[PDB]
Design an enzyme around this catalytic site. Structure first.
Site, PDB file in Angstrom:
ATOM      1  N   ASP A  34      18.898 -37.402  52.005  1.00 26.20           N
ATOM      2  CA  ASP A  34      17.448 -37.237  51.965  1.00 26.20           C
ATOM      3  C   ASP A  34      16.738 -38.265  52.835  1.00 26.20           C
ATOM      4  O   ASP A  34      16.569 -39.426  52.426  1.00 26.20           O
ATOM      5  CB  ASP A  34      16.957 -37.407  50.522  1.00 26.20           C
ATOM      6  CG  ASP A  34      15.494 -37.113  50.377  1.00 26.20           C
ATOM      7  OD1 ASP A  34      14.933 -37.447  49.323  1.00 26.20           O
ATOM      8  OD2 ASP A  34      14.857 -36.579  51.305  1.00 26.20           O
ATOM      9  N   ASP A 214      12.009 -34.351  57.124  1.00 23.88           N
ATOM     10  CA  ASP A 214      12.425 -34.580  55.737  1.00 23.88           C
ATOM     11  C   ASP A 214      13.567 -33.643  55.354  1.00 23.88           C
ATOM     12  O   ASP A 214      13.363 -32.469  55.047  1.00 23.88           O
ATOM     13  CB  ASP A 214      11.219 -34.358  54.831  1.00 23.88           C
ATOM     14  CG  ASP A 214      11.504 -34.599  53.332  1.00 23.88           C
ATOM     15  OD1 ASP A 214      12.622 -34.995  52.936  1.00 23.88           O
ATOM     16  OD2 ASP A 214      10.582 -34.445  52.484  1.00 23.88           O
TER      17      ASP A 214
HETATM   18  C1  LIG Z   1      21.686 -39.055  39.496  1.00 25.43           C
HETATM   19  C2  LIG Z   1      20.630 -38.655  40.527  1.00 25.43           C
HETATM   20  C3  LIG Z   1      19.248 -39.213  40.186  1.00 25.43           C
HETATM   21  C4  LIG Z   1      18.209 -38.773  41.207  1.00 25.43           C
HETATM   22  C5  LIG Z   1      16.813 -39.325  40.889  1.00 25.43           C
HETATM   23  C6  LIG Z   1      15.763 -38.815  41.881  1.00 25.43           C
HETATM   24  C7  LIG Z   1      15.523 -39.480  43.073  1.00 25.43           C
HETATM   25  C8  LIG Z   1      14.580 -39.001  43.964  1.00 25.43           C
HETATM   26  C9  LIG Z   1      13.887 -37.834  43.661  1.00 25.43           C
HETATM   27  C10 LIG Z   1      12.738 -37.350  44.525  1.00 25.43           C
HETATM   28  O1  LIG Z   1      11.565 -37.602  44.182  1.00 25.43           O
HETATM   29  N1  LIG Z   1      13.018 -36.596  45.724  1.00 25.43           N
HETATM   30  C11 LIG Z   1      14.399 -36.414  46.153  1.00 25.43           C
HETATM   31  C12 LIG Z   1      14.821 -34.973  45.966  1.00 25.43           C
HETATM   32  C13 LIG Z   1      15.420 -34.312  47.026  1.00 25.43           C
HETATM   33  C14 LIG Z   1      15.828 -33.002  46.914  1.00 25.43           C
HETATM   34  C15 LIG Z   1      15.656 -32.298  45.733  1.00 25.43           C
HETATM   35  C16 LIG Z   1      16.099 -30.909  45.620  1.00 25.43           C
HETATM   36  C17 LIG Z   1      16.736 -30.454  44.476  1.00 25.43           C
HETATM   37  C18 LIG Z   1      17.199 -29.152  44.340  1.00 25.43           C
HETATM   38  C19 LIG Z   1      17.005 -28.254  45.374  1.00 25.43           C
HETATM   39  C20 LIG Z   1      17.482 -26.812  45.249  1.00 25.43           C
HETATM   40  C21 LIG Z   1      16.725 -25.961  44.231  1.00 25.43           C
HETATM   41  O2  LIG Z   1      15.885 -25.143  44.616  1.00 25.43           O
HETATM   42  O3  LIG Z   1      17.096 -25.971  42.918  1.00 25.43           O
HETATM   43  C22 LIG Z   1      16.333 -25.051  42.125  1.00 25.43           C
HETATM   44  C23 LIG Z   1      16.378 -28.693  46.534  1.00 25.43           C
HETATM   45  C24 LIG Z   1      15.931 -30.000  46.651  1.00 25.43           C
HETATM   46  C25 LIG Z   1      15.050 -32.971  44.667  1.00 25.43           C
HETATM   47  C26 LIG Z   1      14.641 -34.283  44.763  1.00 25.43           C
HETATM   48  C27 LIG Z   1      11.857 -36.174  46.511  1.00 25.43           C
HETATM   49  C28 LIG Z   1      11.524 -37.249  47.529  1.00 25.43           C
HETATM   50  C29 LIG Z   1      10.208 -36.828  48.219  1.00 25.43           C
HETATM   51  N2  LIG Z   1      10.344 -35.469  48.809  1.00 25.43           N
HETATM   52  C30 LIG Z   1       9.015 -34.915  49.187  1.00 25.43           C
HETATM   53  C31 LIG Z   1       8.386 -35.801  50.243  1.00 25.43           C
HETATM   54  N3  LIG Z   1       7.284 -36.562  49.935  1.00 25.43           N
HETATM   55  C32 LIG Z   1       6.930 -37.248  51.071  1.00 25.43           C
HETATM   56  C33 LIG Z   1       7.797 -36.882  52.040  1.00 25.43           C
HETATM   57  N4  LIG Z   1       8.706 -35.970  51.555  1.00 25.43           N
HETATM   58  C34 LIG Z   1      10.808 -34.452  47.845  1.00 25.43           C
HETATM   59  C35 LIG Z   1      12.134 -34.872  47.222  1.00 25.43           C
HETATM   60  C36 LIG Z   1      14.131 -37.159  42.487  1.00 25.43           C
HETATM   61  C37 LIG Z   1      15.079 -37.638  41.594  1.00 25.43           C
END
Ligand SMILES: CCCCCc1ccc(C(=O)N(Cc2ccc(-c3ccc(CC(=O)OC)cc3)cc2)C2CCN(Cc3ncc[nH]3)CC2)cc1
Ligand SMILES: CCCCCc1ccc(C(=O)N(Cc2ccc(-c3ccc(CC(=O)OC)cc3)cc2)C2CCN(Cc3ncc[nH]3)CC2)cc1
Length: 329
Positions: A34, A214
């Site tokens: 990511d 992203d």
């Molecule tokens: C054990 C693992 C613990 C993980 C804890 C954790 C850490 C970070 C985030 C977070 O917030 N993210 C990261 C993220 C990245 C990708 C996904 C994701 C998850 C699933 C899917 C597929 C789907 O459609 O499932 C139904 C597609 C993408 C979800 C979250 C976001 C980061 C910001 N971006 C959006 C953005 N904002 C600014 C620039 N880009 C979205 C993802 C969420 C949770």
């Protein structure tokens, strides 16, 4: 052609994942890679949430190179909390490894039901130090510091569903991934991989828009008012009570995104932002586009954009390079 190449696996044209290991016993995990975040999040054996029960879990007791930290981490997702604590251990990405400070996750409940619904175990951030919790130097920066690579850069050649595999490459730019000229855009902040481009869709325009490259977002996101205007009147329908838009796949009125700078021009035609939903209707597609407002006018150039354009993320030069991805590999 050297460099460290991590193969990427597509899931349903909705996300992709790559594998990496933690611990000197090489405990395996599948990760979202990511560029929109900046910590490494790894689920712990000490996590007993419903979600964790379905995942590969990290056991620090089984690694000789584990260095306890224990600094508490709390993060809010959308309306829930994710919690854990820092740990340091050997992280192996492809053929390279290094001791690295990551977040060992104990409570995943704020990331539900997304976490359980998906097949990945953790999230490996690839953004900048200032985007991280705890001011952690990015993995690629740390690899360079240790002379394990000669250039602190990485590249993404995304997989394409039903067409080809993908790669995250650390340490150099390989010809096999792109065709035509690579053009570079300077970062407007060392935070996200965020660059300034004029955005135009038909007659709608936003000059010098903030555009975030992203890999963790599966859609293109567009300011809400801009989106409203560009979607009139294209024979596109908002799905009642859902934030999705649908259209016939052969809809000739669908516009092309144009992003321009003094350095280059990048376009995103309907074929790259349309997702076939044949199960809900013959010849029907969903738009891989979401309305989203930020404090400054922002487009997220997520996976639909990155599937068309090979991208280079350069920490040393504070820039993003962009070139047409080769159609096949
Ligand atoms: C054990 C693992 C613990 C993980 C804890 C954790 C850490 C970070 C985030 C977070 O917030 N993210 C990261 C993220 C990245 C990708 C996904 C994701 C998850 C699933 C899917 C597929 C789907 O459609 O499932 C139904 C597609 C993408 C979800 C979250 C976001 C980061 C910001 N971006 C959006 C953005 N904002 C600014 C620039 N880009 C979205 C993802 C969420 C949770
Ligand atoms: C046009 C849309 C259809 C195309 C398919 C598709 C599939 C997945 C996504 C996707 O990148 N994610 C990850 C994600 C994307 C964006 C965010 C996000 C996070 C924060 C904010 C708030 C903000 O404005 O920034 C400060 C805004 C957006 C968080 C997570 C989603 C992962 C799945 N969850 C929903 C879900 N389904 C099942 C469980 N969870 C939504 C975000 C996007 C599109």
């Amino acid at each position: 052609s050297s460099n460290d190449n991590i193969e990427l696996v597509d899931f349903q044209n909705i996300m992709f994942y790559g594998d990496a290991e933690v611990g000197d016993n090489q405990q395996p995990f599948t990760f979202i890679l990511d560029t929109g975040s900046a910590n490494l999040w790894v689920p712990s054996v000490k996590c007993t949430t419903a979600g964790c029960l379905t995942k590969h879990l990290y056991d620090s007791s089984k690694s000789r190179t584990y260095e306890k930290d224990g600094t508490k981490v709390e993060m809010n997702y959308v309306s829930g909390t994710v919690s854990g604590f820092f740990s340091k251990d050997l992280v192996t990405v492809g053929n390279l490894s290094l001791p690295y400070k990551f977040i060992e996750v104990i409570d995943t409940n704020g990331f539900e039901p997304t976490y359980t619904a998906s097949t990945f175990d953790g999230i490996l951030g690839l953004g900048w130090k200032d985007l991280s919790i705890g001011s952690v130097d990015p993995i690629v920066v740390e690899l360079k510091n240790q002379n394990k690579i000669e250039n602190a850069l990485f590249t993404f050649y995304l997989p394409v569903h039903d067409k080809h595999t993908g790669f995250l490459t650390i340490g150099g730019i390989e010809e096999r991934f792109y065709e035509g000229p690579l053009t570079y855009e300077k970062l407007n902040h060392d935070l996200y991989w965020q660059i300034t481009l004029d955005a135009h869709v038909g007659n709608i325009m936003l000059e010098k828009a903030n555009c975030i490259v992203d890999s963790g977002t599966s859609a293109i996101t567009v300011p809400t008012d801009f989106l409203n205007k560009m979607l009139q009147n294209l024979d596109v329908i908002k799905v009642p009570f859902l934030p999705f838009y649908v259209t016939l796949c052969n809809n000739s009125k669908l516009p092309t995104f144009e992003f321009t700078s003094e350095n280059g021009k990048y376009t995103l035609e309907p074929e790259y932002y349309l997702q076939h939903i044949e199960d809900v209707g013959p010849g029907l597609c969903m738009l891989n586009i979401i309305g989203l407002d930020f404090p400054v006018p922002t487009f997220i150039l997520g996976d639909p954009f990155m599937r068309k354009y090979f991208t280079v993320f350069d920490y040393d030069n504070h820039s993003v390079g962009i070139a047409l991805a080769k159609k096949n590999l």
